[PDB]
């Protein structure tokens, strides 16, 4: 797992986090697949570091939409999807 992979998996969610409709089925499939690949603490931290960086560069990022992705896509992400998220504390 690396950031390029995270970007590919999450890209289908881009329009949704930018205020568009969704999450699309493709967005959720990517989320579910990424979730499945983030098996170790290290992978989960990687996902966090990668998305933390991605988020800052997304124009019109809708955090409410971003935060609704786990529930809507049926994946457990027991962490607040916030900009100030501390990735070193994800395990």
UniProtKB/Swiss-Prot annotation:
Disulfide bonds join 3-50, 13-27, 28-73, 48-87. Keywords: Disulfide bond, Lipid-binding, Lipoprotein, Signal, Transport. During brewing process, structural and chemical modifications of the protein occur. Both unfolding of the structure and glycation should increased the amphiphilicity of the protein, leading to foam-promoting forms that concentrate in beer foams. The keyword Transit peptide does not apply. A lipid is attached at residue 7 (Cis-14-hydroxy-10,13-dioxo-7-heptadecenoic acid aspartate ester). The keyword Signal applies. It comes from the Eukaryota. Aleurone layer of developing and germinating seeds. One of its GO terms (biological process) is lipid transport. One of its GO terms (molecular function) is lipid binding. Belongs to the plant LTP family. Plant non-specific lipid-transfer proteins transfer phospholipids as well as galactolipids across membranes. May play a role in wax or cutin deposition in the cell walls of expanding epidermal cells and certain secretory tissues. This is Non-specific lipid-transfer protein 1. It comes from Hordeum vulgare (Barley). The lineage of its organism: Eukaryota, Viridiplantae, Streptophyta, Embryophyta, Tracheophyta. The chain holds residues 27 to 117 of 117 of the full protein.
């Amino acid at each position: 797992l690396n950031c390029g992979q995270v970007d590919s998996k999450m890209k289908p969610c881009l329009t949704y986090v930018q205020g568009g409709p969704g999450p699309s089925g493709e967005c959720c499939n990517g989320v579910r697949d990424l979730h499945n690949q983030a098996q170790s603490s290290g992978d989960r931290q990687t996902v966090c570091n990668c998305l933390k960086g991605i988020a800052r560069g997304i124009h019109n990022l809708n955090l409410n939409n971003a935060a609704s992705i786990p529930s809507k896509c049926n994946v457990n992400v027991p962490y607040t999807i916030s900009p100030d998220i501390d990735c070193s504390r994800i395990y």
